[PDB]
Design a protein around this ligand. Sequence first.
Ligand SMILES: *[C@@H]1O[C@H](CO)[C@@H](O[C@@H]2O[C@H](CO)[C@@H](O[C@@H]3O[C@H](CO[C@H]4O[C@H](CO)[C@@H](O)[C@H](O)[C@@H]4O)[C@@H](O)[C@H](O[C@H]4O[C@H](CO)[C@@H](O)[C@H](O)[C@@H]4O)[C@@H]3O[C@@H]3OC[C@@H](O)[C@H](O)[C@H]3O)[C@H](O)[C@H]2NC(C)=O)[C@H](O[C@@H]2O[C@@H](C)[C@@H](O)[C@@H](O)[C@@H]2O)[C@H]1NC(C)=O
Ligand SMILES: *[C@@H]1O[C@H](CO)[C@@H](O[C@@H]2O[C@H](CO)[C@@H](O[C@@H]3O[C@H](CO[C@H]4O[C@H](CO)[C@@H](O)[C@H](O)[C@@H]4O)[C@@H](O)[C@H](O[C@H]4O[C@H](CO)[C@@H](O)[C@H](O)[C@@H]4O)[C@@H]3O[C@@H]3OC[C@@H](O)[C@H](O)[C@H]3O)[C@H](O)[C@H]2NC(C)=O)[C@H](O[C@@H]2O[C@@H](C)[C@@H](O)[C@@H](O)[C@@H]2O)[C@H]1NC(C)=O
Ligand SMILES: CC(=O)N[C@@H]1[C@@H](O)[C@@H](O)[C@@H](CO)O[C@@H]1O
Ligand SMILES: CC(=O)N[C@@H]1[C@@H](O)[C@@H](O)[C@@H](CO)O[C@@H]1O
Ligand SMILES: [Ca+2]
Ligand SMILES: [Ca+2]
Ligand SMILES: [Mn+2]
Ligand SMILES: [Mn+2]
Lengths: 239, 239
Amino acid sequence: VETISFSFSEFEPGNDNLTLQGAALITQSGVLQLTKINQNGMPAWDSTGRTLYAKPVHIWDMTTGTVASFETRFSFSIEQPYTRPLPADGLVFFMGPTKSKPAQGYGYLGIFNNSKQDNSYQTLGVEFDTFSNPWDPPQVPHIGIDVNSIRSIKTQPFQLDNGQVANVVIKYDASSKILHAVLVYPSSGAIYTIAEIVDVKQVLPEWVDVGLSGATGAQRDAAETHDVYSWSFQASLPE
Amino acid sequence: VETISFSFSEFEPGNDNLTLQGAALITQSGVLQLTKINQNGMPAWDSTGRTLYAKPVHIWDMTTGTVASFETRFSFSIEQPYTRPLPADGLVFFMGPTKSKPAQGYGYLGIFNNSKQDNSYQTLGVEFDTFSNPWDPPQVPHIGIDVNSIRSIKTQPFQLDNGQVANVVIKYDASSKILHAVLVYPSSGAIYTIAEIVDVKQVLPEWVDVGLSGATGAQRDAAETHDVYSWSFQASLPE
Ligand SMILES: *[C@@H]1O[C@H](CO)[C@@H](O[C@@H]2O[C@H](CO)[C@@H](O[C@@H]3O[C@H](CO[C@H]4O[C@H](CO)[C@@H](O)[C@H](O)[C@@H]4O)[C@@H](O)[C@H](O[C@H]4O[C@H](CO)[C@@H](O)[C@H](O)[C@@H]4O)[C@@H]3O[C@@H]3OC[C@@H](O)[C@H](O)[C@H]3O)[C@H](O)[C@H]2NC(C)=O)[C@H](O[C@@H]2O[C@@H](C)[C@@H](O)[C@@H](O)[C@@H]2O)[C@H]1NC(C)=O
Ligand SMILES: *[C@@H]1O[C@H](CO)[C@@H](O[C@@H]2O[C@H](CO)[C@@H](O[C@@H]3O[C@H](CO[C@H]4O[C@H](CO)[C@@H](O)[C@H](O)[C@@H]4O)[C@@H](O)[C@H](O[C@H]4O[C@H](CO)[C@@H](O)[C@H](O)[C@@H]4O)[C@@H]3O[C@@H]3OC[C@@H](O)[C@H](O)[C@H]3O)[C@H](O)[C@H]2NC(C)=O)[C@H](O[C@@H]2O[C@@H](C)[C@@H](O)[C@@H](O)[C@@H]2O)[C@H]1NC(C)=O
Ligand SMILES: CC(=O)N[C@@H]1[C@@H](O)[C@@H](O)[C@@H](CO)O[C@@H]1O
Ligand SMILES: CC(=O)N[C@@H]1[C@@H](O)[C@@H](O)[C@@H](CO)O[C@@H]1O
Ligand SMILES: [Ca+2]
Ligand SMILES: [Ca+2]
Ligand SMILES: [Mn+2]
Ligand SMILES: [Mn+2]
């Protein structure tokens, strides 16, 4: 069995196990700030940042046809300081082709280039979307399961607890092909759940990079923070 | 669309919306004690209790072939006062034929009569099992999805936070046929998730009773409490 796992209870600056892209930065306090925070302490608009684990993960094998089961857990907080304009755009946990660079920001969250369902993306993502684009349901924020498109195959609205830490658990069981995600806010006790069938062999390449991406809006002050405090991941490929 | 819903933020003694069976009792403090608590305040062994909602729920229609999506949420606590003998047996949320009475207690949790996979049971259950029987995995406690049998089709071990309140969310999406459950302990922040494919049309009758059942052990002091503080449920059958 081929297993891979990592656990960051906090982030240390200078760590070579994470690939920081775009605006992503690790503070001295051990926080991963996906999107830019200005000197005045306010979140900057027109910002895109990603963080990828430094080693590729073997998700499935074409020869044997076996697929890996995996689980990831992370904690984040989103603070929206202004009433106007509407905050944007969100953050997303994703898996896609290795050696990838940031795609389009804003509503595309740094992982897509347009709003089409294109098999060439070879990307699976679980988004926490804060702005309603034309391809989105009217309710924001919402959790969404993205399969080769920013147009989610399933969404679940949730109430943002401004600035509070949210705990996320995402699990994929290869036998049943179920991707199940949970979001919990310890501050209010709120629990949100979402699940859908996803056959990763029809979406992802055999080896993928795993990461987090965040993005702020296309207009002045259409922004919010996208801070991550911890991140763990484990995958097991039966051989 | 045929919808049904109920929400008990607390339980009131004398309420005619709940059918209490066996040892089940609602205290003056508003707590639903599924299994017996002696005058000395200790849980009694050889006790079985259930609570069913007073109205049957339309889960699916044979004529149109449509099936309902549903969600239930409840909070409970299990206190295990002794080191020896091992505590038992657990509690379970279930759906089965209408007008049913308690079945065998102990490891059968008040909803099964033996350890066979029998289609005649017509029962679906999500258990929180505290004792390892011969049909159980060695790890206890564990969450389990029971389909016409006490021998779960899927299990997920969890660590009991003795006497602390646990929050449970169980959701069934008819379109994908996914039954997903989550258990969260606010006291420790622990989150457990479990999911599996279950086609209710192959298990349950068109109309079912929904309830909670709990049971203590077959030997002296092999017991624990099974207290429920709140319970909500909603089901929607598309027509
Ligand atoms: C977080 O980042 C950490 C820093 O990079 C990761 O730890 C490194 O993990 C490396 C594995 O990829 C590991 O590399 C090996 O280092 C050996 C020498 O260092 C050890 O022994 C020294 C004494 O001899 C001692 O002084 C050191 O303190 C270490 O104990 C070296 O012998 C190995 O070489 C063999 O294997 C390579 C292939 O991997 C062959 O090419 C080579 O011929 C030989 O057979 C190996 O060296 C690395 O080889 C590849 C090359 O590109 C690298 O430059 C070279 O370093 C390295 O020792 C540790 N560093 C430390 C300080 O521990 C950490 O990885 C996790 O933890 C390690 C221990 C391992 O279990 C990994 O699988 C884990 O992922 C990162 N953590 C995470 C979660 O990603
Ligand atoms: C928790 O338990 C509560 C107590 O039982 C539930 O509330 C009852 O819900 C009954 C519905 O099943 C409801 O029954 C009706 O009562 C009507 C008379 O009472 C009202 O009007 C009076 C003035 O006329 C007023 O004084 C009262 O305070 C009430 O406002 C009565 O007219 C209805 O009869 C019609 O419908 C029946 C069929 O249901 C026909 O048979 C009949 O010919 C007529 O057409 C009806 O009466 C009931 O009929 C069936 C019979 O077996 C019953 O004995 C008889 O009572 C009842 O009014 C309320 N009680 C109260 C105090 O509100 C509660 O139900 C939920 O809330 C209600 C309001 C409703 O929305 C339900 O759908 C909800 O489930 C239970 N809650 C839950 C979550 O289960
Ligand atoms: C398609 C696109 O990028 N849309 C963006 C949206 O994502 C958000 O950033 C918004 C902020 O006002 O600006 C545009 O509408
Ligand atoms: C099959 C059966 O009822 N087994 C029971 C088990 O469920 C538990 O109650 C135990 C307590 O010591 O006693 C027996 O082993
Ligand atoms: Ca959006
Ligand atoms: Ca058992
Ligand atoms: Mn969206
Ligand atoms: Mn069991």
